[PDB]
Each structure stands twice: as structure tokens, then as C-alpha cells.
């Protein structure tokens, strides 16, 4: 965010603030491509659920299989601009960058040694009457594993 400053003139320069839960999509930060983009929070990469198949019997049920479900990650952002024409170009650039046809590598900042596989799936409806928008988009990971660094033995 910001740090304490005196009441005098400040002659130095301050650079952009990188949030904690930034995302590397295909090796590029979205904060670098667009100057108004900011990632707020990432939810859905913490806990995992299973699926159990069973049939009813007289004194309960019999379990005959298990499966591991996929994962969906929802990322909330904020896009800000002053001109009405340029925000459409910003959205065009963002959509052209996010759209992919195969899996890619996904890196998060708060986990420096974890690797994800996923792709862009869908986006939420955005507001059409303002120049500051808060919304989210969904990433569909078909492999619910978190990998680590490669070791040779």
C-alpha cells in the first residue's frame, strides 16, 4: 500500500504496488500489460472434495467406488480508466490474452514453489454504466493436483 512520509516535499519516485495474490498466467503478469488492472483476492484453491458412489441396503449402504473432483478458481479484479473509449480496448486486450486452447502453467505469489494447470473458462457480467468495474472470471483446472520442483535421483 503506502508507507509513512513527512510533511515536506518528496523528491523521489514510487512504483506500482504488487498485491499479494498476483497470478502468472502463461508467464505474464496482467498488472504489467494493463496499467489499471489490479487483483483483489483469489478463492477456491484451498480445500478439496471427493465423490462417493453407494447403493442402499437393509442396514445402510455399500461403497463401490471413489473419485476426485475437479477444481474451479475464481479471481476478483478491478479495472479503472478515465476515458470511455480506452476501457473497451483494455477489455479487448485482456480477453485476447486470456483466451487459450490448451492447458498452461499458473503461478501464484503467495505460494512460491507450487505449479498449477488450468485454462480460462468463463467471465461474470460487468457493469455497463461506469468506468470502474469490479467482477470476476473462472479458471477450470481439470487436474486437481499441486506439483513441486523437479528432482533427479
Amino acid at each position: 500500500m503506502y508507507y509513512f512520509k513527512d510533511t515536506k516535499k518528496y523528491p523521489l519516485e514510487t512504483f506500482k504496488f504488487i498485491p499479494t495474490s498476483a497470478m502468472f498466467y502463461d508467464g505474464l503478469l496482467l498488472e504489467d500489460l494493463i496499467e489499471g488492472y489490479t487483483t483483489l483476492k483469489v478463492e477456491g484453491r484451498e480445500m478439496t472434495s471427493l465423490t462417493i458412489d453407494s447403493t442402499a441396503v437393509k442396514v445402510g449402504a455399500i461403497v463401490n467406488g471413489q473419485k476426485i473432483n475437479t477444481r474451479s478458481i475464481t479471481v476478483t479484479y478491478q479495472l479503472k480508466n478515465k476515458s470511455s473509449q480506452a476501457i473497451q480496448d483494455d477489455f479487448k486486450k485482456m480477453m485476447a490474452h486470456l483466451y487459450r486452447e490448451e492447458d498452461v502453467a499458473i503461478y501464484f505469489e503467495d505460494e512460491p514453489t507450487t505449479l498449477y494447470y488450468g485454462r480460462y473458462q468463463s467471465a461474470e457480467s460487468v457493469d455497463g454504466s461506469s468506468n470502474s468495474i469490479i467482477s470476476s472470471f473462472t479458471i477450470f483446472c481439470s487436474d486437481p493436483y499441486k506439483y513441486g520442483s523437479q528432482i533427479v535421483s
Binding site: T48, I68, T114, P144, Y145, K146, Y147, G148, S149, Q150, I151, V152, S153
Partner: protein, 51 residues
């Protein structure tokens, strides 16, 4: 190769050599385990999986 499911010999597919009763995709490694071969020199690539 385990991800694809084939055995390569000098860049050629020779999967037919395996026995019908050998374990191919059931080969799982654990900590402090030893893998040995009497004919060649081994190199193993693996990644730690956390669910």
C-alpha cells in the same frame, strides 16, 4: 515413459517387449525407497504431489 504409456528404445516404440504380468502404471515410489537395476544406470524424474 509413464505419462504417455510407451517404452522407447533408441527413439523407436518397442512396447511389445513387456511381459503380460508386469506392473507399469502401478509403479509408485515413496521416501527412503531403493530402486536398482542390474543392467543399466538409472535416472529418475519425479515431482512431489500435494492434494
Amino acid at each position: 515413459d509413464f505419462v504417455v504409456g510407451k517404452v522407447f528404445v533408441n527413439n523407436l516404440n518397442r512396447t511389445r517387449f513387456l511381459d503380460l504380468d508386469s506392473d507399469f502404471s502401478n509403479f509408485k515410489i515413496n521416501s527412503n525407497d531403493k530402486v536398482t537395476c542390474s543392467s543399466a544406470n538409472l535416472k529418475i524424474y519425479y515431482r512431489s504431489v500435494d492434494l
